Design a protein around this ligand. Sequence first.
Ligand SMILES: [Ca+2]
Length: 263
Amino acid sequence: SSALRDGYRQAGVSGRVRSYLDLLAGLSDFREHFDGSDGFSLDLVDMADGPGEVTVICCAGTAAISGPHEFTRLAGALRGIAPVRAVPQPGYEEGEPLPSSMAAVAAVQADAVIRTQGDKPFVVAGHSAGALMAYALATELLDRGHPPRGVVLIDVYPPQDAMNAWLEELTATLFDRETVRMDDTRLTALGAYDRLTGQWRPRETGLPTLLVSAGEPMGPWPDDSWKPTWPFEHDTVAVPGDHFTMVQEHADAIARHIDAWLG
Ligand SMILES: [Ca+2]
């Protein structure tokens, strides 16, 4: 383990997760950054192949355990349904700098999408804060003449009461599902991205948008205001599972909705 990892777990246990996230963001300021115009680049990951003209491009999340591996199950379920690729969030792996802004990361991701796709159409997808990253990327691509055919936002909470109320539960569950180790590179990246997405605001694009919502909350709620939402026009479906299990244990349900929506 590490001091940062142990501290993060303790922040969950003691109900001080927001404080710990702000500390990680502060620490991240002392790492190397890229601004989008300094030559940094990255590649997409090929996850699966499938028929049709539209590739499903999945953006990695911003959790300390996030990465292209987050979409292995969804990709598995989409094999032979549609091509699938994954976009990394730079800075969660050794030797990668952190973006200095949402614009910087969106620019280098859009470079890689355009490089890889050419004029082959695609949709962009993401989960949780990864959905915000997906939408920022979609916006950048639209602003560059390469609009996606649409955006799939899986359990997005835009700038969040339920997420705030569940921060401790979220943190404990991340450790239960730590299939990729939360090293200090990952924890400081979590800080940086958490601050970037928290300060960012989505712009209206007119893009077809599919909100994929968890079927149930991670804790009791008095009304239905625990659900993911999105401020711009979008279609909505619900799948079995909670914030976490929806896109892993129940990724097949998400695959079927994506299949229908692409139809
Ligand atoms: Ca510069």
